[PDB]
Amino acid sequence: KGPKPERGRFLHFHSVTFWVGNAKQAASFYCNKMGFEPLAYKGLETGSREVVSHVIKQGKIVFVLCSALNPWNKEMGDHLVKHGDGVKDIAFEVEDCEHIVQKARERGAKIVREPWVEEDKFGKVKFAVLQTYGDTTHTLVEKINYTGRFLPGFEAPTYKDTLLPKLPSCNLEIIDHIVGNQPDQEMESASEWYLKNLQFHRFWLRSIVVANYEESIKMPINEPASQIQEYVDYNGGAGVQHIALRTEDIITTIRHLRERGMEFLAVPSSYYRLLRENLKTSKIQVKENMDVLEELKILVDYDEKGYLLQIFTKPMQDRPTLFLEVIQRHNHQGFGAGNFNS
Amino acid sequence: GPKPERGRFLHFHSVTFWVGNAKQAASFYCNKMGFEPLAYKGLETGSREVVSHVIKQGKIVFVLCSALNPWNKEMGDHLVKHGDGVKDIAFEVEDCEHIVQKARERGAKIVREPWVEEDKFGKVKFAVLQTYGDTTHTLVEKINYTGRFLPGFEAPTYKDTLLPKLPSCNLEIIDHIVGNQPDQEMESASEWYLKNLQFHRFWSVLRSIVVANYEESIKMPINEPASQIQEYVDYNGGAGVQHIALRTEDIITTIRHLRERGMEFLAVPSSYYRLLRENLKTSKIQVKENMDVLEELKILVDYDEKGYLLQIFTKPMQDRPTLFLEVIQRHNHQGFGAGNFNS
Ligand SMILES: COc1ccc(-c2c(S(C)(=O)=O)ccc(C(=O)c3cnn(C(C)(C)C)c3O)c2C)cc1
Ligand SMILES: COc1ccc(-c2c(S(C)(=O)=O)ccc(C(=O)c3cnn(C(C)(C)C)c3O)c2C)cc1
Ligand SMILES: [Fe+3]
Ligand SMILES: [Fe+3]
Ligand SMILES: [Fe+3]
Ligand SMILES: [Fe+3]
């Protein structure tokens, strides 16, 4: 686990910022199909002339959908052309932002944006931006006084989707893990970035999972050994492969996501055949009805106390890059290890 | 004017959109605007550069396209320049080759010379012409083509299980597509159609010219700033499609069902309905549709007193103030809502 960082603390995942072709429509999609609700907005009517942001939320999970407002936006434009719709930033909520940044800077990290504070009638938030793998960044968020719904400069949603209230709740709670795919031979250095610059440790296809000291933030890093390489080809470099969202009841979550029209990967019925006979001879017993798990196409993986339940959406875009995961944990910490093979 | 010797522009065949995320765009138009998945072309069918989701409602066909690879020059530039928007407006035609011949000789730029595609379900001949801005027209001439859409396009690769639980919007056919032009460019843009395709000026009753095929099944309004048209041009990066109007035979049911899906439309002052009610008193047309429900739904009314139309606009389809949609219903009336600016 290494030494306990003397200063600073990464509390949790604060938000995930997506740079997409059409933020409005991306926001419509994640709300309707994945159970998110509109939280806040920033764009032409709030005085924001370069970038639009639609902020949506479910449980603790905050996704931010961004688009350029102007033709020939260099940085957002290049990224859009390069990656397609995908993750730009992984935000962490922290204690002592200034020290985390000092430390990261000393150790070699590139500071994209030096610490800054933004305030309203609701209080102050301190921010800083660092560069991780590929074009992916981390925004550090340190709330001082704050009482606001999301962040300073973001107004109430400009819009409303009247269908949202009529669709069933998906009950997704919090971000469990966010995976970063790397080019050939860049897994060590991508992960070393966290070990050195942020004082993470190794928590736990070629993979390595890094985690903050208290292990509230988990970030798997993969390299090809290939699915990963396909990712890289279509992403044109390193980036987020999947986001895992945790639920406390995956049967209800997947039933409601499926009712909303979300599609998941196919699982052959022999998976369940094997799973049932494997389970007979073992310590662990799955609480969730096996007949319904199989109907729903949920995967199970188990150790000697616990078991995870997990399931993977179809890609969020036509490029074979980003997808989502829904996971439920029963005293287990592994990641789908067994199901990966089958 | 004179009927053109050879060729016919039967109908709007479909509208191709070039978009950041084809799959999510197809999701949006299906769920919110009532379209259904019709066909697909992408990695699974052997199309390696371009992905296409084809969706349909009544006779309206929208094609949603994205590049599959990093650094697509043409589609990448288009997307950075315009955002999500219309790339191509297909016309189904008779006698593709002579239409193209005629346009070639009167000076039109042929983006793609006539060519034929063949599927096991038949043959289709295509041609591509360049119109305003980056917008093209694809000519489609079908030779007993019996497939779901066009050769090379297969079954929709997937499903959206919510679609059948949502109510029918009953949109029938494209009524008109408007192109906004930069300052001083209406004349040029409209002229292209009179000379290269042998359209004529369409009359009825911001600057605008309506242009239309002989038979008047195709109507393309051309706008120019006086301003909203300039705002469009600012955010679009140049000329392009401002709005697509979709005809319905029952706008009350259409707009009730679109609002139930969560689509949003423009705000209409309640005094508009005060003054429409007052005016209709001394008017020789009488509106069939219940006025109190029209007001509830924020539908607009225009009437020359031989007939009338009913009209309503979506919010933008994107965050840039470029493209939006129109739902229209016609009752013996050929105008386009002119009186409603002023209302
Ligand atoms: C997109 O084609 C595929 C292939 C495998 C998975 C897949 C499967 S599957 C569906 O094939 O059975 C099982 C577990 C995990 C999963 O989340 C995993 C595996 N390693 N890690 C770590 C964190 C170590 C990277 C994960 O997070 C994954 C990604 C998902 C989609
Ligand atoms: C503020 O955003 C909007 C949206 C629609 C109009 C708007 C209005 S509204 C309310 O503002 O008055 C009335 C009719 C039409 C309409 O479709 C129209 C007018 N001319 N043509 C032609 C064919 C001549 C271009 C049309 O197609 C349109 C686009 C105006 C502003
Ligand atoms: Fe339910
Ligand atoms: Fe995972
Ligand atoms: Fe109804
Ligand atoms: Fe119109």
Coordinates of N, CA and C in Angstrom, one line a residue, chain B residues 223-326:
Chain B
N223 N -33.1 31.2 -48.0 CA -33.1 32.4 -47.2 C -31.7 33.2 -47.3
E224 N -31.8 34.5 -46.9 CA -30.8 35.4 -46.9 C -31.1 36.4 -45.8
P225 N -30.1 37.0 -45.2 CA -30.3 38.0 -44.1 C -30.8 39.3 -44.6
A226 N -31.4 40.1 -43.7 CA -32.2 41.3 -44.0 C -31.4 42.4 -44.6
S227 N -30.2 39.7 -37.0 CA -30.9 38.8 -38.0 C -30.6 37.3 -37.7
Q228 N -31.7 36.6 -37.7 CA -31.7 35.1 -37.4 C -30.9 34.3 -38.5
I229 N -31.1 34.7 -39.7 CA -30.4 34.0 -40.8 C -28.8 34.2 -40.7
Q230 N -28.4 35.4 -40.3 CA -27.0 35.6 -40.0 C -26.5 34.9 -38.8
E231 N -27.2 34.8 -37.7 CA -26.9 34.0 -36.6 C -26.7 32.6 -37.0
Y232 N -27.6 32.0 -37.7 CA -27.4 30.7 -38.4 C -26.1 30.6 -39.1
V233 N -25.9 31.5 -40.0 CA -24.6 31.4 -40.8 C -23.4 31.6 -39.9
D234 N -23.4 32.4 -38.9 CA -22.3 32.5 -37.9 C -22.0 31.2 -37.3
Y235 N -23.0 30.5 -36.7 CA -22.8 29.2 -36.1 C -22.7 28.0 -37.0
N236 N -23.2 28.1 -38.2 CA -23.1 27.0 -39.1 C -21.7 27.0 -39.9
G237 N -21.1 28.2 -40.0 CA -19.9 28.3 -40.7 C -20.1 28.6 -42.1
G238 N -21.3 28.9 -42.6 CA -21.6 29.1 -44.0 C -23.1 28.7 -44.2
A239 N -23.4 28.6 -45.5 CA -24.8 28.3 -45.9 C -25.1 26.8 -45.5
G240 N -26.4 26.6 -45.3 CA -26.9 25.2 -45.1 C -28.3 25.1 -44.7
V241 N -28.8 23.9 -44.3 CA -30.2 23.6 -44.0 C -30.5 24.2 -42.6
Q242 N -31.5 25.1 -42.6 CA -32.0 25.7 -41.4 C -33.1 24.8 -40.8
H243 N -34.1 24.4 -41.6 CA -35.1 23.5 -41.1 C -35.7 22.6 -42.1
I244 N -36.2 21.5 -41.6 CA -36.9 20.5 -42.3 C -38.4 20.4 -41.8
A245 N -39.3 20.7 -42.7 CA -40.7 20.6 -42.3 C -41.4 19.3 -42.7
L246 N -42.1 18.7 -41.7 CA -42.7 17.4 -41.8 C -44.2 17.6 -41.8
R247 N -44.8 17.0 -42.8 CA -46.3 17.1 -42.9 C -47.0 16.0 -42.1
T248 N -48.1 16.4 -41.5 CA -48.9 15.5 -40.8 C -50.4 15.7 -41.3
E249 N -51.2 14.6 -41.2 CA -52.6 14.7 -41.5 C -53.4 15.1 -40.2
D250 N -52.8 15.0 -39.1 CA -53.5 15.4 -37.8 C -52.5 16.0 -36.8
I251 N -52.4 17.3 -36.8 CA -51.4 17.9 -36.0 C -51.7 17.9 -34.5
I252 N -52.9 17.9 -34.1 CA -53.3 17.7 -32.7 C -52.7 16.4 -32.2
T253 N -53.0 15.3 -32.8 CA -52.5 14.0 -32.3 C -51.0 13.9 -32.4
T254 N -50.4 14.4 -33.5 CA -49.0 14.4 -33.7 C -48.3 15.2 -32.6
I255 N -48.7 16.4 -32.3 CA -48.1 17.2 -31.3 C -48.3 16.7 -29.9
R256 N -49.5 16.2 -29.6 CA -49.8 15.5 -28.3 C -48.8 14.4 -28.2
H257 N -48.6 13.5 -29.2 CA -47.7 12.4 -29.1 C -46.2 12.8 -29.1
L258 N -45.8 13.8 -29.7 CA -44.4 14.3 -29.7 C -44.1 14.9 -28.3
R259 N -45.0 15.6 -27.7 CA -44.8 16.2 -26.4 C -44.8 15.1 -25.3
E260 N -45.6 14.0 -25.5 CA -45.5 12.9 -24.6 C -44.2 12.1 -24.6
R261 N -43.5 12.1 -25.8 CA -42.2 11.6 -25.9 C -41.1 12.5 -25.3
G262 N -41.4 13.8 -25.1 CA -40.5 14.7 -24.5 C -39.9 15.7 -25.4
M263 N -40.3 15.8 -26.6 CA -39.9 16.9 -27.5 C -40.3 18.2 -27.0
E264 N -39.5 19.2 -27.2 CA -39.9 20.6 -26.8 C -40.0 21.5 -28.0
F265 N -41.0 22.4 -28.0 CA -41.3 23.3 -29.1 C -41.2 24.7 -28.6
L266 N -41.4 25.7 -29.5 CA -41.2 27.1 -29.1 C -42.3 27.6 -28.3
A267 N -42.0 28.7 -27.5 CA -43.0 29.3 -26.7 C -43.9 30.2 -27.5
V268 N -45.2 30.2 -27.2 CA -46.2 31.0 -27.9 C -47.0 31.8 -26.9
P269 N -46.9 33.1 -26.9 CA -47.7 34.0 -26.0 C -49.2 33.7 -26.1
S270 N -49.9 33.8 -25.0 CA -51.3 33.5 -24.9 C -52.1 34.6 -25.5
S271 N -51.6 35.8 -25.7 CA -52.2 36.9 -26.5 C -52.3 36.6 -28.0
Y272 N -51.4 35.8 -28.5 CA -51.5 35.2 -29.8 C -52.8 34.6 -30.1
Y273 N -53.2 33.7 -29.1 CA -54.6 33.1 -29.2 C -55.7 34.1 -28.9
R274 N -55.5 35.1 -28.1 CA -56.5 36.2 -28.0 C -56.8 36.7 -29.4
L275 N -55.7 37.2 -30.1 CA -55.8 37.9 -31.3 C -56.1 37.0 -32.5
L276 N -55.7 35.7 -32.5 CA -56.2 34.8 -33.5 C -57.7 34.6 -33.4
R277 N -58.2 34.4 -32.2 CA -59.6 34.2 -32.0 C -60.4 35.4 -32.5
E278 N -60.0 36.6 -32.1 CA -60.6 37.9 -32.5 C -60.6 37.9 -34.1
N279 N -59.5 37.7 -34.7 CA -59.4 37.8 -36.2 C -60.3 36.8 -36.9
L280 N -60.4 35.5 -36.4 CA -61.1 34.5 -37.1 C -62.6 34.8 -37.1
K281 N -63.2 35.5 -36.1 CA -64.5 36.1 -36.2 C -64.9 36.6 -37.5
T282 N -64.2 37.6 -38.0 CA -64.5 38.3 -39.3 C -63.8 37.6 -40.5
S283 N -63.6 36.3 -40.4 CA -62.8 35.6 -41.4 C -63.6 34.6 -42.2
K284 N -63.4 34.4 -43.5 CA -64.2 33.5 -44.3 C -63.7 32.1 -44.2
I285 N -62.5 31.7 -43.7 CA -62.2 30.3 -43.4 C -62.6 30.0 -42.0
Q286 N -62.9 28.8 -41.7 CA -63.1 28.4 -40.3 C -62.2 27.2 -39.9
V287 N -61.5 27.4 -38.8 CA -60.5 26.3 -38.4 C -61.3 25.1 -37.9
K288 N -61.0 24.0 -38.5 CA -61.6 22.7 -38.0 C -61.1 22.4 -36.6
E289 N -59.8 22.4 -36.4 CA -59.2 21.9 -35.2 C -59.6 22.7 -34.0
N290 N -59.9 22.1 -32.9 CA -60.4 22.8 -31.7 C -59.4 23.8 -31.2
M291 N -59.9 25.1 -31.1 CA -58.9 26.2 -30.9 C -58.3 26.1 -29.5
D292 N -59.1 25.7 -28.5 CA -58.6 25.6 -27.1 C -57.5 24.5 -27.0
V293 N -57.6 23.4 -27.7 CA -56.5 22.5 -27.7 C -55.3 22.9 -28.5
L294 N -55.5 23.7 -29.6 CA -54.4 24.3 -30.4 C -53.6 25.2 -29.5
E295 N -54.3 26.1 -28.7 CA -53.6 26.9 -27.7 C -52.9 26.1 -26.7
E296 N -53.5 25.1 -26.1 CA -52.8 24.2 -25.2 C -51.5 23.7 -25.7
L297 N -51.5 23.2 -27.0 CA -50.3 22.7 -27.6 C -49.4 23.7 -28.2
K298 N -49.7 24.9 -28.3 CA -48.8 26.0 -28.8 C -48.6 25.8 -30.3
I299 N -49.7 25.4 -31.0 CA -49.6 25.3 -32.5 C -50.1 26.7 -33.1
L300 N -49.4 27.1 -34.2 CA -49.6 28.3 -34.8 C -50.5 28.1 -36.0
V301 N -51.3 29.2 -36.4 CA -52.3 29.2 -37.5 C -52.0 30.3 -38.5
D302 N -52.0 30.0 -39.8 CA -52.0 31.0 -40.8 C -53.1 30.7 -41.8
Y303 N -53.7 31.8 -42.3 CA -54.8 31.6 -43.2 C -55.0 32.8 -44.2
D304 N -54.9 32.3 -45.4 CA -55.4 33.1 -46.6 C -56.8 32.6 -46.5
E305 N -57.7 33.4 -47.1 CA -59.2 33.0 -46.8 C -59.8 32.3 -48.1
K306 N -59.2 31.1 -48.3 CA -59.5 30.1 -49.3 C -59.1 28.7 -48.6
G307 N -58.3 28.9 -47.6 CA -57.8 27.7 -46.8 C -56.9 28.3 -45.6
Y308 N -56.2 27.3 -44.9 CA -55.3 27.7 -43.8 C -54.3 26.5 -43.6
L309 N -53.2 26.9 -42.8 CA -52.3 25.9 -42.4 C -52.1 25.9 -40.9
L310 N -51.6 24.8 -40.4 CA -51.2 24.7 -39.0 C -49.8 24.3 -38.9
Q311 N -49.1 24.9 -37.8 CA -47.6 25.0 -37.9 C -47.0 25.0 -36.5
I312 N -45.9 24.2 -36.3 CA -45.2 24.3 -35.1 C -43.7 23.9 -35.2
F313 N -42.9 24.6 -34.4 CA -41.5 24.4 -34.5 C -40.8 23.8 -33.2
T314 N -40.0 22.8 -33.5 CA -39.1 22.3 -32.4 C -38.1 23.3 -31.9
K315 N -37.6 23.1 -30.7 CA -36.3 23.7 -30.3 C -35.2 23.1 -31.2
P316 N -34.1 23.8 -31.2 CA -32.9 23.3 -32.0 C -32.6 21.8 -31.7
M317 N -32.0 21.1 -32.7 CA -31.7 19.7 -32.5 C -30.3 19.6 -31.9
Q318 N -29.6 20.7 -31.7 CA -28.3 20.7 -31.2 C -28.1 22.0 -30.4
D319 N -26.9 22.2 -29.8 CA -26.7 23.4 -28.9 C -26.4 24.6 -29.8
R320 N -25.7 24.5 -30.9 CA -25.6 25.6 -31.8 C -27.0 25.9 -32.3
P321 N -27.3 27.2 -32.5 CA -28.6 27.6 -33.1 C -28.6 27.5 -34.6
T322 N -28.6 26.3 -35.1 CA -28.6 26.0 -36.5 C -29.9 25.3 -36.9
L323 N -29.9 24.0 -36.9 CA -31.0 23.2 -37.4 C -32.2 23.0 -36.4
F324 N -33.4 23.1 -36.9 CA -34.6 22.8 -36.1 C -35.6 22.1 -37.0
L325 N -36.8 21.7 -36.5 CA -37.8 21.0 -37.3 C -39.1 21.7 -37.3
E326 N -39.9 21.5 -38.4 CA -41.2 22.0 -38.4 C -42.2 20.9 -38.6

